[PDB]
Amino acid sequence: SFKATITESGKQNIWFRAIYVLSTIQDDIKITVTTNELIAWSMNETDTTLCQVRFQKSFFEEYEFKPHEGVQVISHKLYSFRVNGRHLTTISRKPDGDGIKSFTIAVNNTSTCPESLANRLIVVIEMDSLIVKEYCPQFQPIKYDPIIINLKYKINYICCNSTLLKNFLDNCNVNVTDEVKLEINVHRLSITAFTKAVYGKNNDLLRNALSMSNTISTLDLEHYCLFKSIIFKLKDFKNFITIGPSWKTTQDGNDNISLWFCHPGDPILMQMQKPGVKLELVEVTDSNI
Amino acid sequence: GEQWYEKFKPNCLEQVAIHKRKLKDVQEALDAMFLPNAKHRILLLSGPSGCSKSTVIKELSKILVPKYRQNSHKVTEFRGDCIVNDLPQMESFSEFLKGARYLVMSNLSLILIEDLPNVFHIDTRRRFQQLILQWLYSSEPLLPPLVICITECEIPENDNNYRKFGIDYTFSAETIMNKEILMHPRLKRIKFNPINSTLLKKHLKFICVQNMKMLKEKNKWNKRQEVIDYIAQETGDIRSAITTLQFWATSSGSLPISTRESTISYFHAIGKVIHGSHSTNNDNEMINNLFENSNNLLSKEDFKLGILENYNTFNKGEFSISDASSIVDCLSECDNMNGLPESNEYGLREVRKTFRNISKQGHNHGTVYFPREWKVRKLQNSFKVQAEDWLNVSLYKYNAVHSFRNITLEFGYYAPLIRKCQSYKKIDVVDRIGGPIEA
Amino acid sequence: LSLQLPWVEKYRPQVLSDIVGNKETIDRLQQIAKDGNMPHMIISGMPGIGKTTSVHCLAHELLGRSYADGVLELNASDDRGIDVVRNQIKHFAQKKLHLPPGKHKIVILDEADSMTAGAQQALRRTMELYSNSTRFAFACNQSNKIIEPLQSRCAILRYSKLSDEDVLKRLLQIIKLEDVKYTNDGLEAIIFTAEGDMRQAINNLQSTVAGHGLVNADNVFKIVDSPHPLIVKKMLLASNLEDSIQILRTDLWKKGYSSIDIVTTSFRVTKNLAQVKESVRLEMIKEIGLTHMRILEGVGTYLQLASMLAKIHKLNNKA
Amino acid sequence: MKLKLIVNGCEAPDDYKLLRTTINTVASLRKTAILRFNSERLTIISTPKDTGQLWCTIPHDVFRLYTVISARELNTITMECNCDSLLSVFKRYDRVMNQGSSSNMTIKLQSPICALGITFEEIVHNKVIMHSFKVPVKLLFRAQDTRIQEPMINYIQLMMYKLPPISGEFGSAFHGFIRRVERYSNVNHIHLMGVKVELKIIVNELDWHLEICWNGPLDSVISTHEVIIRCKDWKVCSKLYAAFEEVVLAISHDESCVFHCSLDRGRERGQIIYYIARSKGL
Amino acid sequence: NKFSASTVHLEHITTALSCLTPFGSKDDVLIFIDADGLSFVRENNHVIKIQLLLSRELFMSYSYRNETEDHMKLCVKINHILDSVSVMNRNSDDIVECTLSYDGHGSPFVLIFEDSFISERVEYSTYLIGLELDRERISFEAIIKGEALHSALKDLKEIGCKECYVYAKTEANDENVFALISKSQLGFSKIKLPSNRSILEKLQVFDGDSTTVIDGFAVIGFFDFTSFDKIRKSTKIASKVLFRMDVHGVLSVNILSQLPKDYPGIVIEVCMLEKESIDEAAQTEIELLMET
DNA sequence: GCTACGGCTATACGG
DNA sequence: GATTCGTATC
Ligand SMILES: Nc1ncnc2c1ncn2[C@@H]1O[C@H](COP(=O)(O)OP(=O)(O)OP(O)(O)=S)[C@@H](O)[C@H]1O
Ligand SMILES: Nc1ncnc2c1ncn2[C@@H]1O[C@H](COP(=O)(O)OP(=O)(O)OP(O)(O)=S)[C@@H](O)[C@H]1O
Ligand SMILES: [Mg+2]
Ligand SMILES: [Mg+2]
Secondary structure: OEEEEEOOHHHHHHHHHHHHHHHHHOOEEEEEEOOOEEEEEEEOOOOOEEEEEEEEOOOOOOEEEOOOOOEEEOOOEEEEEEEEHHHHHOOOOOOOOOOEEEEEEEEOOOOOOOOOOOOEOEEEEEEOOOOEEEEOOEEEEOOOOOOOOOOOOOOEEEEEEHHHHHHHHHHOOOOOOOEEEEEEOOOOEEEEEEOOOEOOOOOOOOEOOOEEEEEEOOOOOOEEEOOOEEEEOOHHHHHHHHHHHHOOOOOOOOOEEEEEEOOOOOOEEEEEEOOOEEEEEEEOOOOOO | OOOHHHHOOOOOHHHOOOOHHHHHHHHHHHHHHOOOOOOOOEEEEEEOOOOOHHHHHHHHHHHHHHHHOOOOOOEEEOOOOOOOOOOOHHHHHHHHHHHHOOOOOOOOOEEEEOOOOOOOOHHHHHHHHHHHHHHHOOOOOOOOOEEEEEEOEEOOOOOOOOOOOHHHHEEOHHHHOOHHHHOOOOEEEEEOOOOOHHHHHHHHHHHHHHOHHHHHHOOOOOOHHHHHHHHHHHOOOHHHHHHHHHHHHHOOOOOOOOOOOOOOOHHHHHHHHHHOOOOOOOHHHHHHHHHHHOHHHHOOHHHHHHHHHHHHHOOOOOOOHHHHHHHHHHHHHHOOOOOOHHHHHHHHHHHHHHHHHOOOOOOOOOOOOOOOHHHHHHHHHHHHHHHHHHHHHHOOOOOOOOOHHHHHHHHOOHHHHHHHHHHHHOOOOOOOOOOOOOO | OOOOOOHHHHOOOOOHHHOOOOHHHHHHHHHHHHHOOOOOEEEEEOOOOOOHHHHHHHHHHHHHHHHOOOEOOEOOOOOOOHHHHHHHHHHHHHOOOOOOOOOOEEEEEEOHHHOOHHHHHHHHHHHHHOOOOEEEEEEOOOHHHOOHHHHHOOEEEEEOOOOHHHHHHHHHHHHHHHOOOEOHHHHHHHHHHHOOOHHHHHHHHHHHHHHHOOEOHHHHHHHOOOOHHHHHHHHHOOOOHHHHHHHHHHHHHOOOOOHHHHHHHHHHHHHOOOOOOHHHHHHHHHHHHHHHHHHHHOOOOHHHHHHHHHHHHHHHHOO | OEEEEEEOOOOOHHHHHHHHHHHHHHHHHOOOEEEEEOOOEEEEEEOOOOOOEEEEEEEHHHOOEEEEEOOOHHHOEEEEEOHHHHHHHHHHHHHHHHOOOOOOEEEEEEOOEEEEEEEEEEOOOOOOEEEEEEEEEEEOOHHHHHOOOOOOOOOOOOEEEEEOOOOOHHHHHHHHHHHOOOOOOOOOEEEEEEEOOOOEEEOOOOOEEEEEEEOOOOEOOOOEEOOEEEHHHHHHHHHHHHHOOEEEEEEOOOOEEEEEEEEOOOOOOEEEEEEEEOOOOO | OOEEEEEOOHHHHHHHHHOOOOOOOOOEEEEEEOOOEEEEEEEEOOOEEEEEEEEHHHOOOOOOOOOOOOOEEEEEEOHHHHHHOOOOOOOOOOOOEEEEEEOOOOOOEEEEEEOOOEEEEEEEOOEOOOOOOOOOOEEEEEEEEHHHHHHHHHHHHHOOOOEEEEEEEEOOOOOEEEEEEEEOOOOEEEEEEOOOOOOEEEEEEEOOOOOOEOOOOEEEEEEEHHHHHHHOOOOOOOOEEEEEEEOOOEEEEEEEEOOOOOOOOEEEEEEEEOOOOOOOHHHHHHHHHHHO
């Protein structure tokens, strides 16, 4: 029914990193097979964050999709299924000393397949040494929910470089720090990763207050339109940032991330783009005015 | 094709098996907790299994969350089995709480912690304690309402060791939450009771008439009433009652009706040992079933202390001194058997026989109480601290080694008297150590 | 060469029709198998009366060909920690296996009485999450070891001790299948020694056939011994001290029974002794406890047991 | 209560390396550390109060600016800080010059529980990226500072061994000799041997024996000396030996072991002393 | 001394002894000493056995003065032996010179290390003191390169692999297939080796007599992966791994890792038992997934 | 081509 | 299991 194959080193790297991050968001990864793109998205248990990765048809060198033969009509056909994040991220990993020359993912939900492949995702990996390894993880068909925040947000706009943001975010520790304060001044943009303190009964300290900050001027900011303080989580931002530079493309010169937020209540849009990969992150912001 | 307790779940507040007073004082607490400035931060629900603790919160959130939510419906239930790649197991609840803290304005959602994290591992239990302690003591201007439902069940014996803890014996709110959490101004606790016979009978009748054709086909419609009354009499669990009724209805033979057996409480066991149990006039059978079903509670020094404390409440202390002497002598004899099961059996049997021989109609018994031995231990600890202070000051200002035995005998009373006159007529410790001895 | 399956496993029932004992419960299991809507169930009873085999036969007749990938049998021999329960049970419950309209996946948890409490809470969560696709069957010796919230969602079925007639019927079926010589007195002795345990009856019968051939009372009582609870009960109920002392000596001390075993058996018998007064019962319990303490502390001689019997008789005949 | 200091790693390499080594040692030893800011020197203390104590002395000339003012005697500001936050700050600042820079690290005591405003700059390639940090600390009381004192060492049987400098020919061989006992997984006690010059590492157990000996030249600055200590302290000694050219080992007979490290800044010399108690008796 | 040997290539000894690390971390190790060399035989739960062959030519001072017995057997611990041979002999100018010694019964196993600057003497007390396939009933024989088998084993380890399967089927058209089917949390996992002569240099399937080369029938091996992962570190340094299995459910692995010019490498022999496989329908799914 | 350091993993510890 | 106070129902 659906067949997609990756035959590039960088594309495999970005695919594996996206799968790993979607696993770090929720234990189960939701993948929807469209006729133009392959969307892999994951929503938090508390429904406070949402990240979707759209692998277009240009990303794979074949995208044979046969929805006529989970199946949804919106006309365009949509097939969605639920797969384990940990099981999927241990398949797409790059072995040490062995190069993945081909990574093909498929699901043949037809009468041709037997029960050993029914409700079983088919992923085939061919190494450079001609060793063929293929797996059959279990999947569960579900219904896709197209939440509209990208069309709703297209409020200030921020387009900053992802390199220094990646350095600052990767230097943070999610164990001692769990909060992001992105304040933008009319001159400078400052992002500080802090943690609030909790006081005990007799003014004790239940939790400390570590504040690791960073401030950057306006010239490094590629584009800014105030048309401001927003507060949200840290780990999801770290993973969504580290997704991008996995596909090393020096010829491509984007290396930026676009931001959108309106008020402390409404969520913040977090977007980066690749040749055949569109990446989006949604996070519920802190409503404290 | 579906389970009856799942296909006949309540759709509104009127179909929930709950007392009117319980519904009222849960509704009031939940409504007060949705206010912009709520005195109570979290809501703690405790009770036995199948007492409509979880469902009533759902039906209340169906009508409270859509009302207080801002403009720009259900609960946000914690799920413990979720294994995230970059998430240590003890950090899962912390991440859940941090994510759920962003549910105040325009994202309002009640938080229902029905299944707690793994509290039988001590590290994550302490993490849970200090995580819910930070929520109560948080400096956040406003937080989403938090509801914690804890099922009070007795943990059966698993491993053999005398380092058994409170969580190892029974699974209750007292064993999970410490004293700081339970006795907190911003914590409201609403204990639950088993469903009474009336609501159970009404709901079983409703379920039966909802499937009238299937009971009339199996000619069980005429016998449904006695089954409903007997099931409502045996157990107070709505889920167990509905499951048993479904099992009886789907059956085609004379299989006897059986339900789950609820454990006997501590004061319930004390009353059973002292005053006996109705519908069972054989003391041997009652004691054997009590030891077979509640061996965890019976095989404890707390139970013998409870018997010693509460055996005088049989007739407000109006019985012969020979019976009391026999009871206390038997308890003292049992105390020398090093915790053998024969000791507990003999003690309970002797107490029951003694109270059965003197039992008469028209007796007006008293109220039983928990043993005061923990208060005595706390007083002894305070005395130990004060005696350590006395020995430290006596070994710092001068050289004098006195034994704690002499501190308790003579120096606990004579030395404060010496320091009193010495000071008023003119050292640090002037009051009697451990307070005065009264009566 | 040595290739011969023991009669316990060689004659293990493969269908619900071959299970004797609780006729009503087996009929209910057959009705469940023919209907398909198996609910969550808990099976408890004495060992060796047909709990594990009943669940396995029910699963076999409920799934058939799909039994290979439709059941998940976990027992005490396998790891059943909270991590194992989490991973394996969640993955098996989430699996979308196509089944007949009335068919469901079965999670057989044998020896559920020996599972950790955190695993029980994880099982509660899994039942509340995935009750519409898979069902849990519990096999245990006592239902008290399974926590109350787990029992709330389960239909408890209690297995009674096997009667003499059902044991005799199954035994006679095994004789007719194996074609060995037997005597009615020998079969009665086998049933009497089994004490309602079907596996014990099969083991004793197989040992008698393999050691002596013809199954009479003489051979059976020469290979297997009478149950020591009955001997202890006879010893405790003796009228005069001399007869009780003689029975104790010639039936437990010359036979090679440990004194601690005798004391524990006496405690159990006194706990389950009828036709005695409550005061007498508690006095004998106290005496047995004192003797137990003396045995545990090191003094485990025959003199202590003789003194225990003497004190029991003194309290029986008063003073 | 006005504490402020500025550190420039590129301007003065040796004392910055001394500070980094002290921070690494106090982080590896145990969580939290005691920073005693005397008006003329800074002492970093790791007091577990059997487990060892590290007493490092850092002169005021190490830092570019050392304004220390408090109402206590000799402007003694004593503070307890988590080493992990300070270690992370120091790693960031070390990578700042590693990527190429010469910016100074400004530290101020900005408010008993306070925090240090450790802020520095970094330039990627001509961009300005301000790195701001706030490490929560507690202010130790004056009497509580008096409860912490350096343990004096008796010289009745204590004997000094001048370990060879690591920059010399024998330095690498002696470092290998010191770490020769670290490659055993099941070792918890090292029983030293000095008879009057040899250093012998003896690990005697129920069914195995070890006889590491140093056959190279050694000096004793100016009789058997045996003390058995835990392996974890020996790892700290090996780490300290690699970072210090002037290393002095003192062994007391069945009493204690002293690992003295000195940095000749001449100027007041920076010194690190690691007092180690015997794990058990001979 | 009844036996003495000196060596300077401590890295080879370190890797050879580290091949036993996948086995019991801290248990006993049994050592034969004879004229040909010394060997390290290790067994775990009577289901798997490893064996080293350190030849005499590997050492340069092998003496073996013993004459009462043809071989000397001693049983000692393995962890401290590994730590002893873990010198890594750095500083190429001054090479560490080991000296193994044993003076018969009642003497410790001495390991003297000399650096001309550091002298270390390690003594180990000895303690008080099978799985072989018959060379007539071999079901299949395979010769796989070490790198491919190590990669397959590592991938199996990284996916859990509670149970593993071995597939060996020959065809009349000179086509050979070798795959590793695994039971894990994922379900059915297979890793089929290429049919080229670079990796699958030889694969012969017999009729249980080691002589008749029969085609079209597949040899199945059900092995517990706890025993299978014991060979993973052995295949890391292997240049060519030789696979053999008889009908009696015994798997033998011949590690051929081809420094002295005369010694013929280190010979590592791993023998492993096969699971009973009570479920007869599992092999049916194995062959059904193999046919597709 | 070699070394340092970061990430992955096996093992001991703790409660 | 007991007591004490408050309701709903017959
Ligand atoms: N009329 C009813 N009133 C209450 N519960 C009902 C009713 N009819 C069906 N039920 C079901 O009975 C079950 C009762 O579960 P709850 O008591 O709400 O859960 P609980 O209080 O957390 O018990 P535990 O401790 O989780 S076993 C639910 O599954 C309900 O859907
Ligand atoms: N009702 C029965 N009819 C025929 N054979 C029986 C019956 N009950 C038990 N057996 C035999 O008992 C053996 C296995 O019994 P099981 O059912 O496994 O024991 P159990 O009842 O599960 O008790 P436990 O708690 O598991 S030890 C087989 O040899 C069966 O043939
Ligand atoms: Mg519930
Ligand atoms: Mg069984």
